Amino acid sequence: KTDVIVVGAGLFGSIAAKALAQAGLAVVGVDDSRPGAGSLPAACLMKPSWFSSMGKDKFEPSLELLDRIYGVKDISFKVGLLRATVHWCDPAQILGDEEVPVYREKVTALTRTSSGWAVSLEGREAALEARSVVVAAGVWTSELVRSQALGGLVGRAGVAFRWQDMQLEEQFISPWAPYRQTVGFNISPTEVWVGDGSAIKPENWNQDRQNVSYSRCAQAIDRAGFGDQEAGRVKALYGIRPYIAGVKPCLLEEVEPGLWALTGGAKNGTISAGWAASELVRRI
Ligand SMILES: Cc1cc2nc3c(=O)[nH]c(=O)nc-3n(C[C@H](O)[C@H](O)[C@H](O)COP(=O)(O)OP(=O)(O)OC[C@H]3O[C@@H](n4cnc5c(N)ncnc54)[C@H](O)[C@@H]3O)c2cc1C
């Protein structure tokens, strides 16, 4: 009766699971909410010039899927003296959607059965059953499935900041280095999100490194000097992105019959989740 089990309910598991559910499948999710997941700090802003490598071949079917399922909003961002249109999917809408039921437990094993796949859970005598399994477990995907591509999965950490009870009159993109932009916008009607775009080897991460990105972000919105961290006015959101070098969109591979690995979204984020989901609707 269960068609697909999706392991992981970050952006990639959430989007894939709901696209399959919308396509008529019986989908079940499993997620253990482990700390440092990649999707908590995400803004889900998609500027078309950021995704040139992808190609209209993939950008457009992906954006259409996200618009059909969640709705895509067009935001006119300030870019110096000029303006630029950026597409937005509300991350709270993607990550909080409840169509797909999610077991808030830890997957410990995957086993082929005669009818499909059995998904073991920590501390559970029975396994969850499905014809197919999509493992969208972020940087932890290689803990459950292995492949030459997954042998290259590493984490690229980063931080973004959310200021409470605040709105920007001007949502902006401002560069601080080639291909490094400080982005500030109204992520909710009450909150301002700012990120500087840096990615870090999770080893080279510490409070000093975080304060460097905080200084960038707070100067871009004129909050430097106000001690907003110590005062509780801003939340730091740390996450580890799943990076695999050389990935086309992201990694979507059928490692065994019915067993898919969906990860490697550090490079392109939400738009490549949309591409992968459209692929899975076609192929499952
Ligand atoms: C600072 C920062 C800024 C970002 N900004 C953006 C942005 O503007 N736009 C954008 O699109 N993206 C953004 N991202 C996100 C980026 O695209 C990530 O690559 C993306 O979130 C990856 O999502 P994922 O679903 O593959 O992984 P994750 O979000 O890490 O999800 C993996 C999930 O799998 C679960 N899991 C793992 N193993 C198991 C197990 N054994 N059993 C059960 N559950 C398990 C984990 O608990 C977790 O919830 C940002 C990330 C960071 C850190």
Query: Would you list the domain boundaries of the chain?
Result: 4-75+89-153+245-283, 154-243
Cα dihedral: 74, 78, 79, 85 (round 10): 10
Helix (H, G, I), strand (E, B) or coil at 139: helix
Q: How many CB atoms lie within 10 A of CB 110?
A: 19
Tokens of 219: 């100067």
Contacts of 263 (CB under 8 A, 6+ apart): 12, 135, 136, 137, 138, 139, 141, 150, 153, 242, 244, 250, 251
271 phi and psi angles, rounded to 5 deg: -65, -30
Alpha helices in the chain (DSSP H): 11-22, 56-69, 91-96, 207-220, 228-231, 270-283
CATH class for the domain made up of 4-75+89-153+245-283: alpha beta
Method by which the coordinates were obtained: X-ray
Atom of ligand 1 nearest to the CA of 137: 34
Tokens of 263: 């990860």
CA–centroid distance for 23 within its chain = 21
Short-list 246, 272, 240, 261, CA closest to 150: 261
What residues pair up with 184 in beta bridges, in sequence order? 172, 194
CA–centroid distance for 91 within its chain = 9
Distance, CA of 86 to CA of 66 (rounded, Å):
14
Helix (H, G, I), strand (E, B) or coil at 205: coil
- Ligand 1 centre distance from Cα of residue 46 (Å): 16
Question: Given the structure tokens 């916008």, which residue do they identify?
Answer: 185
Question: CB under 6 Å to ligand 1: residues?
Answer: 7-13, 30-34, 37-39, 41-45, 106-107, 136-138, 140, 144, 158-160, 195, 239, 241-242, 263, 265-266, 269-270
19: left (phi over 0), alpha (psi -120 to 50) or beta: alpha
**259-263 β-sheet, strand order:** 102-103, 27-30, 4-7, 132-135, 259-263, 251-256
Short-list 141, 149, 114, 119, CA closest to 257: 114
Count Cβ atoms within 10 A of the Cβ of residue 279 and give its class: 0-12 exposed, 13-18 middle, 19 or more buried. buried
Max Cα distance, the chain (Å): 63
DSSP state of 43: -
Contacts of 125 (CB under 8 A, 6+ apart): none
Single-letter amino acid code for the residue at 133: V
Identify which of 32, 97, 173 to mutate to test ligand 1's pocket (most ligand atoms within 8 A of the CB): 32
Strand ranges, E, within the chain: 4-7, 27-30, 45-46, 73-79, 82-88, 102-103, 107-112, 117-121, 128-130, 132-135, 154-164, 172-177, 180-188, 191-195, 234-243, 251-256, 259-263
To one decimal, the resolution in angstroms is 2.3
Distance, CA of 112 to CA of 258 (rounded, Å):
9
- Ligand 1 centre distance from Cα of residue 250 (Å): 13
- Ligand 1 centre distance from Cα of residue 89 (Å): 15
**117-121 β-sheet, strand order:** 107-112, 117-121, 128-130
DSSP state of 52: G
Distance, CA of 72 to CA of 138 (rounded, Å):
24
Q: How many CB atoms lie within 10 A of CB 183?
A: 21
Question: Given the structure tokens 């459950």, which residue do they identify?
Answer: 144
Distance, CA of 92 to CA of 44 (rounded, Å):
10
Crossing angle for the helix pair 56-69 and 270-283, to the nearest 10 degrees: 90
The residue whose C-alpha atom lies closest to atom 50 belonging to ligand 1 is 42
Distance, CA of 18 to CA of 27 (rounded, Å):
8
Q: How many CB atoms lie within 10 A of CB 83?
A: 12
Distance, CA of 144 to CA of 261 (rounded, Å):
9
Short-list 143, 115, 130, CA closest to 32: 143
